[PDB]
């Protein structure tokens, strides 16, 4: 059911703020410009607050789940607060039995083909690929000849001018940060759509 | 209390919309753009739905109202869904009686000195002056001859070349609809923050 | 059945004279001339005559109403004459009764949102909009969000230049007074055409 | 009487001042610059004090009214004072009795078609229409039509460059205020003259 949800809607927000006050309004400018993927990092101040009270935009449509996961105590809060999803900026065999006992779908950071085949070995074929500025498409097309059922979700320097380009390697979506999340909520809205509709333009 | 929300937002979003959905959409787009006061207006479908969904935004500083409430029967739905003000077109004593019983806010619209000097009588100094397209900067500065203690919050035709004027006329607040609330969420958000920085450039 | 012939000949002749044969041969110009509903105003000496003498009119398909009807006892004069309609400049309780008790089409003058909401609880969704060249079509567009169920007949600087205007601001029809009927009946049968061909080019 | 003054005099001064002092020394002015018609408006602090103090010009031909009374108890004090005639902004049913009742000259406020007839059925045929700035010389051309007994004394924006297209409309008389009234008592004085004399070239 999650990978149908990251396949139709191809584009994650990957949300980084200072308060529980700013990663609210920041999830609503994302979501009114029309991305339904939201994923609230562990790096904002009480994180499980943020998503329990954004529980509301579900009925709405809206995807919550919790980003920069690096504990199971972290994601047990995440998903006693509601998180659809989760996902850490690495490999973690904890969160992944966890997650599974929980029936949450767990989407683990890989940088090499040794962690690929080791979260493959746990079930996984959906995969962050991360820091994906430092790591570029040209890994996931040079993935696709050993390994052509794994799907690829980059994070890291995913932008309006690389986007296509991420899609054109085989990417099943891609994780926004900075390029997304960064500003005021208005400018936040404007960035949504420009990159939906950037997304749609490359993608069908 | 009231009084000092209008005083201090100066803005009121009038809220037209075809669907309780619309409706939200839009509220949400206003609010994102920095306006708090929020009137759901009763030609909107299922208008107490929309003004008792929205009961989260409260939380965050939204003031959610009723408009166009034209029976008691409208007011009391308005009431119990959760309205912190009512809004008329006109001048209505049994929304006037029922709004003093249930200690809600009640802003009777007016368009004549009759009709001023009868919300007087029932207790209101703060007035809708409704069409305001139509009565003008002009009839305001008229009246604060005569009234030099009724203030107005003028709906109708208000927009971003106009504002300024009304506000030069001695207007306490603005209502405006179709030129903040018509067109897509991110272009009502993007005119809602156009309406908050042109008031402000001229009554600071 | 009132409202579908108003919607069907979209223009009423206001008929104002200073003698009973003025005024027949002012309605029989503006009849000639493809004008159906023809409202005799009560500042015609002896109206209810005129009405009367009128009568054969009828059988060739015109419809003779009565206006500036300010009494019930203009009003019995009317009906008792055969006037298939009342008009007034103003709204009158007593005039609505009568009119309802006779099984008699009224439609009341309004200027304000306030007497349009007293028209509509005397049953009365079809208002006269009286003075039209002070409230404007802008009366009608402003009335529309609030009253979406409420049609205006204006009357009062209704003109060749600006009739296409009222019915762009979604008027049911015109009332047309000087414009129409000032000048010989030769020049009145040929403005009354020159009406009908002009409202016809705009609401087609 | 009241209105063989007001036809004769064709002007009223309507005096709007912030004590007793720069009231009595504008009512000076004006009846200096030949204006026999004053209205000492309730907005001026202790107004009854104001027009017992100014009955000594009586002796002298000017005629001392009140203004902006919109309550019997300072009808009373007015008529108390020496008042020879009350205006109001409004129709007031309280005052327009109690002014019967006492013998003394009412003009009630009027903006409506509605309003108007309510007046006429409490026994008035000069109105004062009001704010005059609103509605314009068109609404006394329109009331002409079916109101051709009914004198209007528009009150609100009248001016130097409009006061002949009053007259021209078929106004009674003009009530001019900040027009007139608004300087010093010397500039006052010259504004009084220029005002008798401009209404003098287009009225005789």
Redesign the interface.
Known sequence: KMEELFKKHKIVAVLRANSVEEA??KA??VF??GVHLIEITFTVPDADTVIKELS?LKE?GAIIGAGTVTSVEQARKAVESGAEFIVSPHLDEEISQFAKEKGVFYMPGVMTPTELVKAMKLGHTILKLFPGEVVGPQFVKAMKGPFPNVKFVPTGGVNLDNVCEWFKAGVLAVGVGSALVKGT??EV??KA?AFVEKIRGCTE
Request: no cysteine; net charge positive; hydrophobic share 55%.
């Open positions: 609210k309004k609503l400018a009114l410009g509301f709405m909520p208005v809205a404007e759509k």
